[model samples]
Target: GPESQLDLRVQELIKLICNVQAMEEMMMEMKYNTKKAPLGKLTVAQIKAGYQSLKKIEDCIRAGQHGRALMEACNEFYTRIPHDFGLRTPPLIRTQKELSEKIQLLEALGDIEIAIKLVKSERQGLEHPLDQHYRNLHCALRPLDHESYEFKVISQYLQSTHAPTHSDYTMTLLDLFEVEKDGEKEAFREDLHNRMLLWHGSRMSNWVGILSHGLRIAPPEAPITGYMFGKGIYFADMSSKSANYCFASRLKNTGLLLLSEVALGQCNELLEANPKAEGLLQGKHSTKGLGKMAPSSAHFVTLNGSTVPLGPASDTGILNPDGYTLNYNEYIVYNPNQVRMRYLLKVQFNFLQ
Candidate 1:
C-alpha cells in the first residue's frame, strides 16, 4: 500500500508537470496565434488554493529546483516576446562590470578577504563563475598571521579610511585580516591615547594658577606642639557619663622649631587621639612631602592661601620653640620676600643615600 501511494504521488507530479509545460508552451507562442487568448480571472480563494498546491509541489522537489523551474518558464515566455518585454541586459552587465572593478581594486589594495566577500555576495547558484576564485581567495586570506607587517599596514589603512556608518564592514575586515599579536604594543598605544584624552580634558577646564611652592609632611615618629583650634573635641561617654575635656592649643612661635621625623609622628598621634580631629585632614597629599598641606588638619595652617605645615624642631627636645628651622638641603625659597608661605621644603630624609 505504501509503494502504491508513492506511485500515485509520482503519477500526479508527472501530470502536473505536463500540464504546466503545455501552458508554458501556449504562453510562449501566444504572439504567433491568430486569435489572442482572452485573459481569465480566478477568485481570490481559488488562486490561494492553487498557490498552496503549487507550494506543496515545490516542497516535494529538491532544494532550489522549484525556483529554477519558475526561472526557466519565465525565460521561455520572454524568448517569444518583443525585445522590450524581455529582461534588460544593460544594467545587469553594467553592475557586473562595476563589481569586477571593485574586486580588482580590493585585490590591488591587498584586501583579498573583502574581495572574496564581494564575490560571495554576488555568487549565483551551483554554476557561479567566481566560486573557485572565492574559495581560493578565502583560503589565502584566512591564515593571515598577526605578526606579519601586512596585517598592521592593512589595519592602519582600514582605520584611516573607515566611516562610522560602515562600522560593520570595518569589523568584518578586521575579523578576517587584522589579528593583534603584540599585546604590549597595543597596550602602549592605548595608554598614549588615554593620556592625550586627559590632556585635552585639562585644556578644556582652563584653570590658571601660579605654580607656587608648597610643603608636605610625612608621618612623624614624635609629636611637635601646635595650636589645635577647631570645633570642640568630644569623646565617647565614660561609664559614669563624665565629660572629657577637649582643648585646642596653639604652640606659640613653633615655626622656627626644627622638627625631626619623630616629632612629626607625635603631632599626628596627638591629632588621632582627639576624636574631633577625625574630619580635619580633607585633601590629598603629594607623594613627596612638597605640596600644599590640609588647611583644617592639625599642625598645618594656610596663610594668604599658602599652606604651612608644622616644621620639625631644630633641637631634639626643645619646647616653646620660635619656628621650625630648615636644614640647608631641605630649604627651598622661591621668593625671599614671602618667607612664611612662598617656600618649598623637603621634610623627608632619603634613606637611599
Candidate 2:
C-alpha cells in the first residue's frame, strides 16, 4: 500500500543517491566524459595526483597569487582528470571561495572512486541483487508502515512544530524510512540522559555523503565562517526551522529531513548567539538556544524511553520579546556520538509561488 503511495521520483532517489550509475550521472551532469573516464575506470592514485595539482592551485589563490604558474597548474589538473569543456579553455580561478568549491569536487572524485571499487567487489556475476546498488552505503534504509506508530508520531511532530509564517511553502510528509543498521556505531550513550527526537534538514546533493559517512564536524582546515554554535551537529524542535536548510524550491519539490535521537543530558541554555558554549558547558552535555518559541514541557510525550517534543509551540518564559536573536529553539551536540540517526522523512514542500 505504501509502495502505491510513494512516488517514482523519491524511489529513484533512494536507489540512485550512492549508486555507481548515479556517480556516472553526476559525471555527465558536470560535463565530464563518462565513456572516456568511466567511474569504475578511475584509480585512487590518479585521483590523488589530480588533487595534489588542485591543492597547488588552491594555495596560490589563497595567497592572491595570479601568475602563469598558477594558471598552468589549473590546466594541468583538468588534463589529469578529464572534463568535457566544449572547446573553451578552462577559466582560471582568482578567488579563494571559487577554488574551495572546486576543491570539494576533487575531494568527491576521490571518495567516488573508492565507492566504485566497493560496489565492484561485491559483484556475484550474472544475477544482480535488486539492492546491489545499496552495497557501498553505510546504512540500510527500509520503508516504514504508513499506519505505524512511529510514522504517526513523526507526522504529528512535523505538523505541530511547523511555523507556517517562516516560509511561503507548506511541508507535507510523503514517506518515511528507518535508518537501520546505523545503531552499531551510534554515539548515543546509555549513561547519557534526557534523549529527545530532533529535526535536521540538508540539501539534496549532500545526502549521499551524509548517509555514507554519517554526519561530520567541519575539519580543522575548513573555514570557520558559519559556525554559529561552534561546529556541531545542529537539530531543532521546530520542523520547519530545520526544513529551511533544505533549500527546496519550486523546481526541486522534494526534500529530506532526519529526526535524530540526541541525548541532551544537561543543557546550557543561552538566549543569544555565543560561540563560548564549549567553555561554558561546565559538565553540561549540550547547548540549546533558549528561545520564546519552544514546545511546552508539560505536553511532552515519551516514546521508546526517550522524550519526544510533539506538543504545540509554547512560550519558554520570554515574555514580550524585544532583543532576542534565536526565536526558534536549536539543539546542538558537540560530539557526533551524542546523536543517533533515527527516521528519515521524504517531504514535499509545495512552493506554488
Candidate 3:
C-alpha cells in the first residue's frame, strides 16, 4: 500500500479501477429511480407481490383470457412497483416484449435490493481507501513491465496497425496489464486453436460493465443494427479501428484498449457485411471481415505461447469479390465463449486539435 502510494503507475491503476465505486453510487440512483420510490423504501416484500402478478400477466397473455385478470395483474404490478407514470391511466404490460421487459426490470430490482445489503455486512470495521475500490469490481489486473518482451510485442501490434497517416489521432501506450476474469477463464474454450490476440476498445464509462460482464451478445432489447455482423463480440487486428470505439476526444484524451485472445478457428471469411453470419451454422468458428490490408503472417511473434501478429500491415493482394469493399479487418464471434480476455492497455490519444 505504501509503495502504491509513491508510484504513479499504481496510482493510475487505482484511479482507473476506483471509478467502479463512484459509478455504482450513480448507477444506484438511476436504477432504483429514487425520486419515485425513496431509497430503501422499495422493500423486497413489495417486489415479491408485484413480480408474482407480472409472471401471471405473461401466462394470461398466452391464455387469451386476460379479460379482467389482465387488468387485475396490471394494476397489481403498478400497485406494488409504484411506477410514477404521469397523471394518465397507468401503463399495462400487454405485448410479449412488454412483458419480457417488465420481467427484466423486476429481476434487476431484486438484484439491486440484495446488492445494497451486502456492503453493509462486508464493511464492518474495514479501514481502506483502495481495497473497497478493487474489491467492488469483478476484474483483476496485474501490471506488466514496460521493458518486458511481451510489452515489446504489443507495442509493435499497436504501432503497425495504428496507421497514423489515415487517422488524425495517435495513441501512446501508458500502462499495460494482464487482465484476469475468473468467469472468462472458465468459459473460454481451451480446446479451440488458431488463437490470436485481438484489439477491443471501449468508452471510459463502459469499462466497468465490459470488465465485469465480459463481452456479451446483443439481446432482443437492443437488436443488432449498426453492426457489421449480427449480435456478437467484435474485435480487430488493427489498433486504431477498435480505438475509434473509445469515443476519446480532445477533452477526454485517455482511453482503455483490451487485447483479447480470440480463437478464430477457420473463420467464415467475408469481404462485406453479412447479417446472417451468426445463423449460418457452417463448420466455421468465427466471422472475419476481410480487408484490403492485413498483418503479414510471416511477421507473427509468439508471446507466452500465444500468437501476437505484431507484424506490419501489408497488402492482402486477395482481390475482393464483386461490389465488396473493406479497409481494415474485423473479427466477430457469435459466442462469447470462444473469446478470452488477455491484456488491458491504458492509452493517451493525442488529437492534433
Candidate 4:
C-alpha cells in the first residue's frame, strides 16, 4: 500500500513537470513568431498548476513521507522551466537605477541572503563594462564577510525568529547593507554596528529595570537617586554629602530615558514623611507600602528652545547593574571646610539615528 501511494504521488509530480515543459515550449514559440500574438492564458495556467502541485509535494515531504527522492523531483521540475518565466526572478536590474529598485524590494522582504545571492548573480551575468561596475559596487556594498561574528550572529538570529512581517531592525540592516557608494561604506558599517548594539542595549536596559526595581525597592529606607548620563541611567544612593557627582548640562536626543514612577513616588514619600516615617524610609524598619516601585513614563527636553508635546513613555529595561558602576572613574572635590568629596555611581545611554 505504501509503495503504491508513493508511486502515485511521484507520477502526479512527473505529469505536472511535463505540462510545465509543454507550456514553456509554447511560450518560446510565441516569442519567435511575429504574426501570431501569443495567447498567454495557457502558459499562465500551466505555471500555476505546476507550482501548486510542487507545493503539495513539498508539503507531503515536509510531513515526513517523501525523502530525498521527492525533493530531487521537485528541484528537477522547477529547473525544467525557463528561469526568467513568470514573476520568477524579480524585475531585471540591468543598470544602477534598476538595481536600486531591486535592492528596495530585497530590503522590503528582509531577505539579506537572497539579496547577496542576487548581487553575486548579477555581477557574474552582466556583460556591459558600466554594468559590471554597478554590479561590483552593489556587491561590495553588502556585508559579505560571512566569517565575521556580527554577520553570523545577525544571520542566525533573523533565521530562527519567526515574524509574520519584517521587523524595522531587519529592514534597516538590509538597507544599510545595500549602501551604494564605496566612500560611504565605512560610515554605513559603523552605523549598522551601532544599530545592532542599541538593540542589544535596549534589551539589557529592560532587564536592568526589572531587577533593579526588585533589589532597590526591597530596601525601604534607602531611596536610590536617578542620574542621567550619555550612555544610560544610574540609580544609586545620593544621601551622603561626599558622594561623587557626574554632571552633564546637555545631552543628545538619541538616548532613551526610563523612569520608575514608583521609585520616585517612594522618594517623595521619604521626603514628605514624619520623623517616624522617615526612619521607615531610611530602612530602619521594613513595613508595608514602603518598597514597591514601578517604572514610569520618561521625560525629554527640547533641542531647540521651542517645546513639543511629549508622547507616551517607552517600555524599556536595564541590562546589568554591574556595568553601570561609577567607581571605575574617580573625581575629587573639596568643600570650603577642606573635606574631600567624591562621587562614583555613574551610568549613561548613547545613541545615533
Say which candidate scores most in lDDT: 2
Per-residue lDDT for 14-72 in model 1, tens only? 23222323332323332322123211221233323333332333333323343556454
Tell me the tens digit of each residue's lDDT in model 4 across 221-288.
11111111111122321111111121111231111111111111112222111223323435221111
What's the alpha carbon RMSD for model 3? 7.5
lDDT of 1: 0.22
Model 3 clash pairs are none
Answer with 3 or 4, whichever has the higher lDDT. Answer: 3
In TM-score terms, candidate 3 sits at 0.70
Q: What is the TM-score of each candidate against the true structure?
A: 0.14, 0.71, 0.70, 0.16
> Which portions of model 1 miss their true places by more than 4 Å?
1-142, 164-170, 174-353
Question: lDDT of all the models against the reference?
Answer: 0.22, 0.72, 0.71, 0.24
Ranking by lDDT: 2, 3, 4, 1
Q: Which stretches of candidate 3 lie over 4 Å from their true place?
A: 1-11, 20-127, 318-321
Question: Candidate 2, overall lDDT?
Answer: 0.72
Which portions of model 4 miss their true places by more than 4 Å?
1-148, 164-180, 185-353
Q: By descending TM-score, how would the candidates be arranged?
A: 2, 3, 4, 1
